[PDB]
Amino acid sequence: LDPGLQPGQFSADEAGAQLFAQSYQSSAEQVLFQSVAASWAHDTNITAENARRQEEAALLSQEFAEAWGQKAKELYEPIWQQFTDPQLRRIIGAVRTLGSANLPLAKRQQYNALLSQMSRIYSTAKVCLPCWSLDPDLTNILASSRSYAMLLFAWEGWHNAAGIPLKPLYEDFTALSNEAYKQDGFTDTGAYWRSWYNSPTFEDDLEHLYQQLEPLYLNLHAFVRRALHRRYGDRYINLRGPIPAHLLGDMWAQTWSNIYDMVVPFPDKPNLDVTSTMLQQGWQATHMFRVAEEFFTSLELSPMPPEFWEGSMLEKPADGREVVCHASAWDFYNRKDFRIKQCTRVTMEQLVVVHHEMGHIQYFLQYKDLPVSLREGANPGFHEAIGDVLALSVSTPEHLHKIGLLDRVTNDTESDINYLLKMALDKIAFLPFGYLVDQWRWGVFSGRTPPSRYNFDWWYLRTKYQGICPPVTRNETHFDAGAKFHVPNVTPYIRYFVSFVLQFQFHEALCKEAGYEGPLHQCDIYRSTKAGAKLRKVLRAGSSRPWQEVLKDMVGLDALDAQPLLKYFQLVTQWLQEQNQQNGEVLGWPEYQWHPPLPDNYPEG
Numbered sequence: 001l002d003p004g005l006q007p008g009q010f011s012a013d014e015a016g017a018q019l020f021a022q023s024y025q026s027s028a029e030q031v032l033f034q035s036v037a038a039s040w041a042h043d044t045n046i047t048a049e050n051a052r053r054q055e056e057a058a059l060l061s062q063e064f065a066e067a068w069g070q071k072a073k074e075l076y077e078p079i080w081q082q083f084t085d086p087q088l089r090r091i092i093g094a095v096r097t098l099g100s101a102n103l104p105l106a107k108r109q110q111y112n113a114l115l116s117q118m119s120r121i122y123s124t125a126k127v128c129l130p131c132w133s134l135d136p137d138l139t140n141i142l143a144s145s146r147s148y149a150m151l152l153f154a155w156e157g158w159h160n161a162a163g164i165p166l167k168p169l170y171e172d173f174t175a176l177s178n179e180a181y182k183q184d185g186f187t188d189t190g191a192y193w194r195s196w197y198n199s200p201t202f203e204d205d206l207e208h209l210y211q212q213l214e215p216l217y218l219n220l221h222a223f224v225r226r227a228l229h230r231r232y233g234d235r236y237i238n239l240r241g242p243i244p245a246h247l248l249g250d251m252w253a254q255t256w257s258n259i260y261d262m263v264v265p266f267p268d269k270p271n272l273d274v275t276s277t278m279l280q281q282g283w284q285a286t287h288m289f290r291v292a293e294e295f296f297t298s299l300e301l302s303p304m305p306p307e308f309w310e311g312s313m314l315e316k317p318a319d320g321r322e323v324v325c326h327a328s329a330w331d332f333y334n335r336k337d338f339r340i341k342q343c344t345r346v347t348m349e350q351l352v353v354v355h356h357e358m359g360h361i362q363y364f365l366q367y368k369d370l371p372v373s374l375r376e377g378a379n380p381g382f383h384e385a386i387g388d389v390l391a392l393s394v395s396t397p398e399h400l401h402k403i404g405l406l407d408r409v410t411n412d413t414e415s416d417i418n419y420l421l422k423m424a425l426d427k428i429a430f431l432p433f434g435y436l437v438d439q440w441r442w443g444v445f446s447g448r449t450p451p452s453r454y455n456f457d458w459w460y461l462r463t464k465y466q467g468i469c470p471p472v473t474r475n476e477t478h479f480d481a482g483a484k485f486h487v488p489n490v491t492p493y494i495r496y497f498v499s500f501v502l503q504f505q506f507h508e509a510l511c512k513e514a515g516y517e518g519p520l521h522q523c524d525i526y527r528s529t530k531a532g533a534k535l536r537k538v539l540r541a542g543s544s545r546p547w548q549e550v551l552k553d554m555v556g557l558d559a560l561d562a563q564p565l566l567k568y569f570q571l572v573t574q575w576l577q578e579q580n581q582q583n584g585e586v587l588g589w590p591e592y593q594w595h596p597p598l599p600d601n602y603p604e605g
């Protein structure tokens with residue numbers, strides 16, 4: 001460690017801790033900057049050399065964390081929890097947790113190489129015709145093909161290509177990760193990940209939310225299954241069984257927006273799939289990001305700085321460059337450089353993703369003057385919810401009209417059902433998936449799911465919660481959890497489930513603050529500077545305060561609450577229930593063992 005980055009000496013008490021923290025933050029930004037930079041260089045240009053540079057940057061970060069980590073424990077270990085300054089306790093508790101820096105050097109090098117290689121496998125995997133990338137090739141197949149056999153080829157090829165080679169590495173990663181966090185006092189890495197919500201009842205609280213939400217999912221599921229049965233027939237769809245996992249428009253069946261075509265209840269009302277209008281009008285990536293930005297500035301939030309426009313990667317490079325295409329928002333921790341890296345495609349769903357990523361950026365801009373340790377969400381679900389809340393307003397038929405994407409205007413019950421059904425295909429269909437991913441990982445980290453049961457337990461949870469089944473046989477050679485980005489990229493998922501509940505709590509409060517007085521699902525906060533100020537207060541707090549109290553200041557309640565989501569969807573919740581009854585549907589999938597047959601031609605599309 002460079003001498004300037006090393007910790008000096010400090011008194012063993014709170015006034016020393018504060019000087020410690022200032023000295024730390026001074027050196028942290030440089031260490032953060034070089035590792036973010038090196039990750040950026042790699043993820044926008046996947047090369048062995050850039051992987052090497054990133055691993056060295058990560059080793060440097062580990063050196064930094066050990067030095068300051070061990071000094072913090074030398075002076076402050078048995079007194080930091082009684083400090084008067086609550087932000088200083090948060091800062092100190094963070095520095096004192098070493099994580100992977102608890103590993104000896106050799107194992108640090110093993111760990112960093114495992115992360116690099118798992119990331120490279122996921123982001124460079126291809127499906128070859130007897131070759132397609134995940135983004136855009138396989139994604140567009142999953143979204144637009146209605147050929148059972150073709151969808152099957154893409155789904156199987158992707159899961160086999162990404163997952164199978166990842167499994168031995170994921171096993172070794174899990175062991176080293178657990179060894180590292182066990183030395184910070186956590187029983188396993190999952191306990192560490194859950195501690196970020198600072199709630200002793202986290203898992204029970206989540207289960208209680210899901211119980212309130214599940215009936216909405218079960219009714220959407222049965223309604224969509226019926227539509228699928230009309231198109232693919234009784235041989236490929238079982239009306240009392242799980243839905244084959246490749247038929248819902250998305251590689252993970254986690255959002256069903258792309259089959260809106262087949263389920264739209266009132267096709268004579270305005271056509272809410274405005275993707276074609278975007279293409280007819282010549283929308284490109286940069287337009288999408290400029291339209292998102294202007295929503296933020298309409299609220300008197302900040303525009304994207306010039307460094308964002310000059311540095312960001314907003315389209316997949318066409319110059320023969322391997323990149324990580326999975327969207328991300330980047331804080332370089334120098335208070336100046338903030339970027340998005342998205343392989344943006346011209347679709348309405350991608351326009352919502354653009355807002356989601358820009359919501360991350362806006363957070364970074366508002367708290368860039370906090371101590372680096374407090375530059376994060378009040379919890380990770382907050383950070384994930386910011387852009388989604390704004391996109392809730394953007395998605396309304398009235399707002400789409402304002403921005404030229406929906407010429408025809410209506411305000412009637414059929415049009416509302418259409419719109420709420422389309423929104424539910426994104427927000428309701430996602431809830432079981434957002435909930436199950438880290439149930440799987442928590443069981444792996446705890447050891448209840450050994451490698452011998454990685455896929456058995458994944459599909460147990462996929463069937464239990466999502467009511468889907470794999471369309472070809474799977475065994476423990478397959479590692480289908482590894483075919484989802486966040487798993488090999490070692491980044492948690494429960495934040496998205498929390499965000500999907502939170503974002504409707506946020507939406508209700510912002511709409512009220514803007515003075516909006518109609519149905520919650522027709523609120524558009526565009527140009528509400530009062531709504532903007534209320535959101536800005538949340539953004540500026542970073543993690544300086546407990547998320548339960550930031551929440552109460554914003555929405556008037558100190559807990560996650562499903563009621564705003566339920567209120568938003570109430571009309572289509574009622575309607576789907578009626579429709580399923582009148583069709584004599586079975587809610588659920590009591591033929592839990594059922595899987596579809598293979599196409600007679602298979603393999604062939």
Ligand SMILES: *[C@@H]1O[C@H](CO[C@@H]2O[C@@H](C)[C@@H](O)[C@@H](O)[C@@H]2O)[C@@H](O[C@@H]2O[C@H](CO)[C@@H](O[C@@H]3O[C@H](CO)[C@@H](O)[C@H](O)[C@@H]3O)[C@H](O)[C@H]2NC(C)=O)[C@H](O)[C@H]1NC(C)=O
Nearest residue numbers: 396397398399410411412516517518519520521522523524
């Ligand atoms: C789409 O239409 C709905 C429904 O409009 C209502 O029903 C129609 C059949 C007509 O009879 C309308 O004249 C009637 O208002 C609109 O929702 C409604 O919005 C108004 C405000 O614009 C609400 O009235 C307010 O009620 C609050 C109490 O909550 C009072 O404090 C206010 O002073 C004001 O009178 C009305 O409650 C609301 N209805 C429902 C069921 O929420 C909606 O605005 C419209 N959408 C668009 C985009 O134009």
Ligand SMILES: C[C@H](CP(=O)(O)[C@H](Cc1ccccc1)NC(=O)[C@H](N)Cc1nnn[nH]1)C(=O)N[C@@H](C)C(N)=O
Nearest residue numbers: 326327328329330353356357360376377383489491496
């Ligand atoms: C599109 C979105 C990408 P994201 O912005 O959430 C992305 C996922 C990710 C995580 C680690 C490394 C690389 C990427 N997260 C980020 O870019 C940010 N670092 C989020 C952040 N949160 N606090 N500071 N930053 C996403 O993954 N959504 C879920 C629902 C999904 N598509 O499965």
Ligand SMILES: *[C@@H]1O[C@H](CO[C@@H]2O[C@@H](C)[C@@H](O)[C@@H](O)[C@@H]2O)[C@@H](O)[C@H](O)[C@H]1NC(C)=O
Nearest residue numbers: 156160164471472473474475476477478598
């Ligand atoms: C696991 O599966 C491997 C892949 O074979 C393909 O998938 C299996 C599940 C069957 O559907 C088979 O018809 C496919 O060819 C097999 O090579 C392997 O032997 C299977 N068993 C084990 C223990 O790995």
Ligand SMILES: *[C@@H]1O[C@H](CO)[C@@H](O)[C@H](O)[C@H]1NC(C)=O
Nearest residue numbers: 045046047048049050319321
């Ligand atoms: C990609 O990385 C290589 C080093 O691995 C570098 O020489 C090259 O300039 C990079 N390409 C771009 C477009 O940055």
Ligand SMILES: [Cl-]
Nearest residue numbers: 380492494495
């Ligand atoms: Cl999380």
Ligand SMILES: [Zn+2]
Nearest residue numbers: 356360383384
């Ligand atoms: Zn995000």
